[PDB]
């Protein structure tokens, strides 16, 4: 009731100014739109675990397409939403980390160090997976992150799985909503979670950036799986803490953080954004949202949303760009 009332309130406020894509009354009740209390950017989400209990397979495909079309809605070239989240949508997706360990075990992967930024270790995928399993305990594992592995360069089975998953088909780089380029991905990686290491902190973080085709801004889409050694969904772990900035504030945010958007993402921003900075940025009228993403969630980031991710529990990500 309250969720629907708040979603309807926000839809009414947006429609007073902007022409939004349409959605049936029956589907609208599955959509959650809210503004972040402190930052005031707008988050759109849904819960696949709830949807799948009410909609048949053809109806769900219709919902998923309308949801993605609404979540990428723009006015005057500017996304209205700062992030879209499909909660639980990857629940039925096969275990991707295990798939790579069993089906591509000898692939040489690059692994970061928990203690030295300048160290990169090469080893077979299978040995990385065994190392992560061996050190996994209470939501983190005591081993380095896996550097991103392109799935597009056998991996067909992983791309087919994503292609068939909820929401994703139309917004794959080759999907119906795409204007198309292997630079788009998908890419796969694994993060072990922030943790103290024997003690010093391992910070598990991606600085603020805008995603780009390299230069044109682009949308990004991601899939999160918790790391598990082979269950109440409402208690599933938070895996990322996310800060997204309203796309309308791209230039204000970049100027405040002294970002060089010509740099590649990794070197666009040299300042970590924390609540002190967010509160100072708010005084300039910048809007943002801060939220957690949980295991088995999918998400997407419209173009020109500057965003910053922190890994708070061990997870795998599969992510790509889509030129809508
Ligand atoms: O997950 C991360 O650490 C960054 C993910 C991201 O930045 C994206 O999906 O565009
Ligand atoms: Fe990104």
DSSP string, 248-268: GGHHHHHHHTT--TTS-GGGT
The resolution in Å comes to 1.8
Question: Which of 189, 206, 224 gets mutated to test ligand 1 (max ligand atoms within 8 A of its CB)?
Answer: 206
How far is residue 183's CA from residue 319's CA, in Å, rounded to a whole number?
12
DSSP reduced 3-state for 78: strand
Q: What is the DSSP letter of 295?
A: T
Residues with CB under 6 A from ligand 1: 206, 211, 220, 222, 240, 301, 307, 309, 317, 319
With 0-12 / 13-18 / 19 or more C-beta atoms within 10 angstroms meaning exposed / middle / buried, residue 53 is exposed
The answer to whether the annotation marks 299 as part of a ligand binding site is yes
**Residue minimizing CA distance to atom 10 of ligand 1:** 220
Residue 304 token pair: 């020109």
The sign one gets for the Cα dihedral 71, 32, 26, 8 is negative
Residues recorded for the chain: 324
| Ligand 2: centre distance to CA 261 (Å) | 13
| Ligand 1: centre distance to CA 309 (Å) | 6
With 0-12 / 13-18 / 19 or more C-beta atoms within 10 angstroms meaning exposed / middle / buried, residue 90 is buried
Neighbours of 39 (CB within 10 A): 23
Q: What is the DSSP letter of 272?
A: -
**Residue minimizing CA distance to atom 4 of ligand 1:** 309
How far is residue 150's CA from residue 39's CA, in Å, rounded to a whole number?
34
- Contact, 141 vs 193, CB < 8 A? yes
- Answer left, alpha or beta for residue 77, where phi above 0 means left and psi between -120 and 50 means alpha: left
- Residue 223: strand pairing partners: 298, 318
How far is residue 98's CA from residue 95's CA, in Å, rounded to a whole number?
6
DSSP reduced 3-state for 132: helix
Residue 156 token pair: 């067909």
φ, ψ dihedrals at 320, nearest 5°: -155, 170
Name the closest ligand to CA 265.
2
| Ligand 2: centre distance to CA 6 (Å) | 28
- Among the atoms of ligand 1, which is closest to the Cα of residue 299? 9
φ, ψ dihedrals at 174, nearest 5°: -100, 10
The answer to whether the annotation marks 211 as part of a ligand binding site is yes
First to last CA, the chain: 34
How far is residue 35's CA from residue 38's CA, in Å, rounded to a whole number?
9
| Ligand 2: centre distance to CA 83 (Å) | 11
Q: How many helices (H) and strands (E) does the chain have?
A: 9, 22
How far is residue 287's CA from residue 38's CA, in Å, rounded to a whole number?
9
Neighbours of 265 (CB within 10 A): 16
Pairing of strands 42-47, 83-87: parallel
| Ligand 2: centre distance to CA 5 (Å) | 32
- Residue 144's alpha-carbon distances to 19, 72, 296, 297, in angstroms, are 47, 34, 22, 23
| Ligand 1: centre distance to CA 242 (Å) | 9
How far is residue 250's CA from residue 190's CA, in Å, rounded to a whole number?
28
Q: For the chain, where are the alpha helices, taking DSSP H only?
A: 2-15, 25-28, 48-51, 57-71, 96-103, 125-135, 156-164, 250-256, 275-282
- Residue 161's alpha-carbon distances to 99, 149, 153, in angstroms, are 11, 17, 17
Residue 55 token pair: 């909609």
How far is residue 119's CA from residue 248's CA, in Å, rounded to a whole number?
38
Name the closest ligand to CA 297.
1
Neighbours of 247 (CB within 10 A): 24
**Residue minimizing CA distance to atom 6 of ligand 1:** 309
Pairing of strands 238-245, 307-311: antiparallel
Q: CA nearest 90: which of 190, 256, 251, 223?
A: 223
How far is residue 324's CA from residue 254's CA, in Å, rounded to a whole number?
23
How far is residue 3's CA from residue 151's CA, in Å, rounded to a whole number?
38
The per-residue DSSP string of 135-199 comes to: HEETTEESSPPEEEEES---THHHHHHHHHSTTTGGGSTTSTT----GGG--EEEEE--SEEE--
- Contact, 205 vs 322, CB < 8 A? no
- Among the atoms of ligand 1, which is closest to the Cα of residue 321? 10
Q: CA nearest 63: which of 52, 79, 75?
A: 52
Q: Which residue has the tokens 């090469």?
A: 122
How far is residue 320's CA from residue 221's CA, in Å, rounded to a whole number?
6
CA-angle at 162, arms to 167 and 55, nearest 5°: 35
How far is residue 219's CA from residue 210's CA, in Å, rounded to a whole number?
9
Which residues, other chains included, contact 265 with Cβ-Cβ below 8 Å and sequence gap of 6+? 206, 209, 210, 211, 212
């Amino acid at each position: 009731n309250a969720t629907m009332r708040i979603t309807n309130r926000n839809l009414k406020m947006l429609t007073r100014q902007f022409d939004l894509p349409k959605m049936s009354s029956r589907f609208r009740k599955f959509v959650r739109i809210r503004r972040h209390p402190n930052g005031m950017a707008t988050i759109i989400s849904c819960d696949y675990n709830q949807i799948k209990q009410h909609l048949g397979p053809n109806e769900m495909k219709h919902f998923e397409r309308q949801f993605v079309r609404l979540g990428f809605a723009e006015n005057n070239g500017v996304p209205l939403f700062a992030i879209g989240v499909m909660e639980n949508a990857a629940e039925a997706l096969h275990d991707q980390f295990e798939w790579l360990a069993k089906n591509s075990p000898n692939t040489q992967v690059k692994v970061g160090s928990l203690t030295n930024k300048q160290f990169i270790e090469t080893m077979p995928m299978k040995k990385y997976y065994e190392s992560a399993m061996e050190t996994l305990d209470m939501g983190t594992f005591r081993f380095g992150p896996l550097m991103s592995l392109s799935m597009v360069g056998n991996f067909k089975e992983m791309l087919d799985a994503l292609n068939a998953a909820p929401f994703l088909g139309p917004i794959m780089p080759w999907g119906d909503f795409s204007e198309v380029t292997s630079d788009d991905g998908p890419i796969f990686w694994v993060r072990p979670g922030e943790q103290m290491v024997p003690e010093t902190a391992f910070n598990d973080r991606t600085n603020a950036h805008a995603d780009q085709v390299r230069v044109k801004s682009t949308a990004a889409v991601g899939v999160l799986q918790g790391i598990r050694n082979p269950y109440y969904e409402d208690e599933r772990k938070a895996v990322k803490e996310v800060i997204v900035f309203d796309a309308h504030d791209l230039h204000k945010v970049a100027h405040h953080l002294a970002m060089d958007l010509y740099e590649p993402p990794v070197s666009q921003c040299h300042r970590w954004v924390d609540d002190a900075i967010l509160n100072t940025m708010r005084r300039e009228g910048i809007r943002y949202a801060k939220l957690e993403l949980h295991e088995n969630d999918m998400y997407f980031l419209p173009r020109n949303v500057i965003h910053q991710f922190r890994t708070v529990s061990a997870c795998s990500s599969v992510a790509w760009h889509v030129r809508l």
